[PDB]
Design a protein around this ligand. Structure first.
Ligand code: A1H95
Length: 175
């Protein structure tokens, strides 16, 4: 059972106009088997649009490619991004590239270390903010986690489930 193809794709932005299907593939095959690899071009001029896509055979290969950033492809540092659902987008077909998540449903007994221990395996955490009531100081049952990079957030929001401190949590991109 293969993971859905959408979860195995990387958009590669910022390409050199000299990058080709072949040179993009040669580069990105270092991190996995590529089932597809295309440079987007103008339909009339064939001039590169400056972005392309690669599709790996597995999600672990996507992760390996993302963990090997920064990627300098044909002399230019490119911008890889994995796909997320429309619910974590501001408009169809656009990526909301952010470093912060909202975590809801954690109630009053969840502490900073619960969030750190769980989320640190998705990326490097810079800020954990457990939200408390402005008047009483009581925990409100939600938090924000800020990472050093957007791929952590992208991996997080595409999971169907997050269980933190025994709670089934709602997690979404923030700001
Ligand atoms: C497959 C994938 C992953 C991440 C972003 C992304 N896109 C945003 C930039 N514009 C292209 C056409 C779509 N596509």
């Amino acid at each position: 059972p293969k993971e859905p193809e959408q979860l195995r794709k990387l958009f590669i932005g910022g390409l050199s106009f000299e990058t080709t299907d072949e040179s993009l593939r040669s580069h990105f095959e270092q991190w996995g088997t590529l089932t597809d690899c295309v440079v987007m071009r103008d339909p009339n001029t064939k001039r590169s649009r400056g972005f392309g896509f690669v599709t790996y055979a597995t999600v672990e290969e996507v992760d390996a490619a993302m963990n090997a950033r920064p990627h300098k492809v044909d002399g230019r540092v490119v911008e890889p991004k994995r796909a997320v659902s429309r619910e974590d987008s501001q408009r169809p077909g656009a990526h909301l590239t952010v470093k912060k998540i909202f975590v809801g449903g954690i109630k009053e007994d969840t502490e900073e270390h619960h969030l750190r221990d769980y989320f640190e395996q998705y990326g490097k955490i810079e800020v954990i903010e457990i939200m408390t009531d402005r008047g009483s100081g009581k925990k409100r049952g939600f938090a924000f986690v800020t990472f050093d990079d957007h791929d952590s957030v992208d991996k997080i929001v595409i999971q169907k489930y997050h269980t933190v401190n025994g709670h089934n949590c709602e997690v979404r991109k923030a700001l």
